[PDB]
Amino acid sequence: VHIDLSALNPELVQAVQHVVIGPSSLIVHFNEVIGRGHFGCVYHGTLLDNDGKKIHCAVKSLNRITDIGEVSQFLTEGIIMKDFSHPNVLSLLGICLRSEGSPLVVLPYMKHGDLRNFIRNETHNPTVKDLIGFGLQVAKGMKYLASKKFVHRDLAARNCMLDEKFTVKVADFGLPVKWMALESLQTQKFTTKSDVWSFGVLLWELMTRGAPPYPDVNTFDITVYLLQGRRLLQPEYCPDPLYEVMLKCWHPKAEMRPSFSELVSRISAIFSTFIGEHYVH
Numbered sequence: 001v002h003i004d005l006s007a008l009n010p011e012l013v014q015a016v017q018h019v020v021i022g023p024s025s026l027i028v029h030f031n032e033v034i035g036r037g038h039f040g041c042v043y044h045g046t047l048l049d050n051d052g053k054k055i056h057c058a059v060k061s062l063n064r065i066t067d068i069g070e071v072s073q074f075l076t077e078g079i080i081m082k083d084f085s086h087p088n089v090l091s092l093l094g095i096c097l098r099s100e101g102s103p104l105v106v107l108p109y110m111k112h113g114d115l116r117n118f119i120r121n122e123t124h125n126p127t128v129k130d131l132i133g134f135g136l137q138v139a140k141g142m143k144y145l146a147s148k149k150f151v152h153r154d155l156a157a158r159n160c161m162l163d164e165k166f167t168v169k170v171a172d173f174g175l176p177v178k179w180m181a182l183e184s185l186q187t188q189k190f191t192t193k194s195d196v197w198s199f200g201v202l203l204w205e206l207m208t209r210g211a212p213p214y215p216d217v218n219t220f221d222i223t224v225y226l227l228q229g230r231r232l233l234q235p236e237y238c239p240d241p242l243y244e245v246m247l248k249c250w251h252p253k254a255e256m257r258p259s260f261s262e263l264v265s266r267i268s269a270i271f272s273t274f275i276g277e278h279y280v281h
C-alpha cells in the first residue's frame, strides 16, 4: 500500500492534526497480532508520552483503504471519534497517516476483548446482576452517542469491549439482519431509534450469555417473522421487567420505542433490585 499523501486538503490535514500520532510516540508490533479477525487486522502497540511512560494499545490496519476519497473519509471519522469522551464509549488514542502502508487506528487495549466472547466463555461466571450491569453500561454509552446525534448502526454484544476494570466500551459505531429494526430491514434507514431495537437484541444476548438470536428463523425470513408480531423469547435467566424493556425496544413503531435516556433510568432501577456480582465496575 503506497498512498500519495501529498494529494490531501490543507484545511482537512490541519483539522486532523490533533488526532495524528506517529513514530515519535507509537511503537507498532507488526509481528504481534490481536484477536480473531472480527475487528480486522489488529496489532499490539505501545504508546509513549513525553517522559517515556508506556501504554498498551491495539493498532488496527485499514488495509482496504486505497484512494484519496477513502483517506479523507478516514480522517473525518478520526476527527469525530477523538471528540467523543465517555467512560462507556471506546476512546481513540489517535490515527496514523503514513506514506508507506495502510492508515492505522490506535485504541486503548481492552483486556477482556469483546462482551459476546466474554459471556460465552464458560470459565467466566457472571451473575444476573452482572449481565444486567453490562447492559446498563452499554445503555449509558448509547445515551452519550445519541446526545451527540451519532447513530451506531451496528450495535451488538460482539461490538462492545471490556477493559481490565470490567468497564464496557461501546465500539464499532458508524449484514447483521437479526439485530436490525423492522424499518431498517425495509427502508434501509438507520436512526437512534433503530439503535434502540439493536440494544434490545443486545440485552437478549446478555441474558442468554451470547446465544445466537432467532435460531430457527432464516435470515431472509426475519422480516415476515417480525411483521407477524413474533419476537425473541424471554431468556431463562431474564426477569419479567427486563423482558418488557426488550419488548418496548422492539416496538413496530420506532417513535414508540424508549430513548436511551429512558432505558438508563429503567435498567438502573431493575439493576438496583438485584444482588450478587462477580464483576464489579
Ligand SMILES: COc1ccc2c(Oc3ccc(NC(=O)c4c(C)n(C[C@@H](C)O)n(-c5ccccc5)c4=O)cc3F)ccnc2c1
Pocket: 034, 035, 039, 042, 058, 059, 060, 074, 075, 077, 078, 080, 081, 090, 092, 095, 105, 107, 108, 109, 110, 111, 112, 113, 114, 161, 171, 172, 173, 174
Ligand atoms: C484482547 O482482545 C482484543 C480484541 C480486539 C480489541 C480491539 O479491537 C478493536 C475494537 C474497535 C475498533 N475500532 C472502532 O471501534 C472504531 C470506531 C468506533 N471508529 C470511528 C467511527 C466513526 O468510524 N473507528 C475509526 C476511527 C478512525 C477512522 C476510521 C474508523 C474505529 O476504528 C478497532 C479494534 F481493533 C481494540 C482494543 N482491544 C482489543 C482487544
